[PDB]
């Protein structure tokens, strides 16, 4: 009852109490991250995809095909359901490549051929 605001281990304010109505509010930092451009090379095409690292796609238009991964949200790549060898590593087991009209895809990494010794 006598406490006003909360703190985490690193002495960063993460909760406050509204002075008028005695309710607890949770403070969350405004979303931020890096922007990564995925390109197959100018010698092949001029089409690129954009990755926003560690950011939800909901906050993306605030500041083509939308796909949300663990490393962030992939804008401009079509998620296939196959699995090939890693051409361009994105993160968390996701790789991108330029396959065939012509588009940039984003599959899941394949760990090589399947084998079973007799």
């Amino acid at each position: 009852p006598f406490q006003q605001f909360g703190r985490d281990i690193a002495d960063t304010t993460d909760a406050v109490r509204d002075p008028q109505t005695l309710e607890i509010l949770d403070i969350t930092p405004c979303s931020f991250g890096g922007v990564s451009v995925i390109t197959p090379g100018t010698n092949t095409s001029n089409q690129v995809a954009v990755l926003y690292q560690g950011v939800n796609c909901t906050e993306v238009p605030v500041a083509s095909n939308v796909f949300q991964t663990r490393a962030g949200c992939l804008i401009g790549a079509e998620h296939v359901n196959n699995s090939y060898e890693c051409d361009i590593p994105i993160g968390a087991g996701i790789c991108a490549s330029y396959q065939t009209s012509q588009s940039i895809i984003a599959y899941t990494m394949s760990l090589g051929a399947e084998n079973s010794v007799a």
Binding site: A10, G33, L111, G112, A118
Partner: protein, 409 residues
């Protein structure tokens, strides 16, 4: 010690020992402008006068993250294909249930891997590893299946199948013990192997400080980040730590100079953090190179290097995954239950000296035999297991005795 006595083991023991090696550390990337001052435009404008003091740090951290991914890739990704153990698991008595994957669990990790896994912003972001834990477990399972089904072959060309009993016979022959020793003691050796693995699981479950290195790495990274965050909120000799008050309740000149001093302090803190991270990453890369070498030499083959792959005479090793690290289970052959004997450099039969082709002369006390140097299986001295060179005048310690010859019908 004496000049004519030798001790030779009459039994053996199969011992399994673990080994923990960190291979990678968490990939953190820290922005420069956001950390120094993430909301004050004039502070960023002032910081712009320092040149490229914010691009070098980002480049270094990016290089460190790439290094971590490369470390994991080179340590674990060493198989061209993904091998699989057969559904029938009759390996002649050897029981690999503790290391083979468990399909019942959702994560498809083995027993020991589960034990290991359970046992173990002001502009800072933590990037995810490129290889998820399931892919690391898949690599580990592929290595285990290839080692169990094939042996040496799958790491040096086309994978070739061979029964596990015969693979173990080859590995025994590779340390100086014949095949009949394994073939005549298969059940005892299998029981010893299973008991050793069970003891390994129990020991890993009981002691709470076995996985010390990975915890050390995690704690060091966390402490560095916490120290950086604490250093963020310091005055550095200015009026107040927060620069919002400095820009509000002060004239532009004095506020500017205080902001400059705060910028210098925070830049020094960031530089120290980056330097420490670089040194720690170099240490981790050395450890990851060692782990990759051990995987190549102990897991994909049999190593004659002493004390490298375990403690004793190396037979085989099994990799196991761990959070930001790898764990090996070095199976080794240790002799036990020695017995005193009397030795002799050679034997004088018919005026000519006789030396053993392979082995050593020993004595019950009255007779003489030829036995292996590592295991005690005496056998009668014969022409086929000895070779003749010179007469009986130059060897210092020759013993008069008689040798037998097969050609006597």
């Amino acid at each position: 010690y004496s000049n004519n006595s030798i001790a030779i083991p009459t039994n053996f023991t199969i011992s399994v020992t673990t080994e923990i090696l960190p291979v990678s550390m968490t990939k953190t990337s820290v922005d420069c402008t956001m950390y120094i001052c993430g909301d004050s435009t004039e502070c960023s404008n002032l910081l712009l006068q320092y040149g490229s003091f914010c691009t070098q740090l980002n480049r270094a951290l990016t290089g460190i993250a790439v290094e971590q991914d490369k470390n994991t890739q080179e340590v674990f990704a060493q198989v061209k294909q993904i091998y699989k153990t057969p559904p029938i698991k009759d390996f002649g008595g050897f029981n690999f249930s503790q290391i083979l994957p468990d399909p019942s669990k959702p994560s498809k990790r083995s027993f020991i891997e589960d034990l290991l896994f359970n046992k173990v912003f002001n502009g800072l972001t933590v990037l995810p590893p490129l290889l998820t834990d399931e892919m690391i477990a898949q690599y580990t399972s592929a290595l285990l299946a290839g080692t169990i089904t094939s042996g040496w072959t799958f790491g040096a060309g086309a994978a070739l199948q061979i029964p596990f009993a015969m693979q173990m016979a080859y590995r025994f022959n590779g340390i100086g013990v014949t095949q009949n020793v394994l073939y005549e003691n298969q059940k005892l050796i299998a029981n010893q192997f299973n008991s050793a693995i069970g003891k390994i699981q129990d020991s890993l479950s009981s002691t709470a400080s076995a996985l010390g290195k990975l915890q050390n790495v995690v704690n060091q990274n966390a402490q560095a980040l916490n120290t950086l965050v604490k250093q963020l909120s310091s005055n550095f000799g200015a009026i107040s730590s927060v620069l919002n008050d400095i820009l509000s309740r002060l004239d532009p000149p004095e506020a500017e100079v205080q902001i400059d001093r705060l910028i210098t302090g925070r830049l020094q803190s960031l530089q120290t953090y980056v330097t420490q991270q670089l040194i720690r990453a170099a240490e981790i890369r050395a450890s990851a190179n060692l782990a990759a070498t051990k995987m190549s030499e102990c897991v994909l083959g049999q190593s004659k290097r002493v004390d490298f792959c375990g403690k004793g005479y190396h037979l085989m090793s099994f990799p196991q995954s761990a959070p930001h690290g790898v764990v090996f289970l070095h199976v080794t052959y240790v002799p036990a239950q020695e017995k005193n004997f009397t030795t002799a450099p050679a034997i004088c039969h018919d005026g000519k000296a006789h030396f053993p082709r392979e082995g050593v002369f020993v004595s019950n006390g009255t007779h003489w035999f030829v036995t292996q140097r590592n295991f005690y299986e005496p056998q009668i001295i014969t022409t086929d297991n000895t070779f003749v060179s010179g007469n009986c005048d130059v060897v210092i310690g020759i013993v008069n005795n008689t040798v037998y010859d097969p050609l006597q019908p």
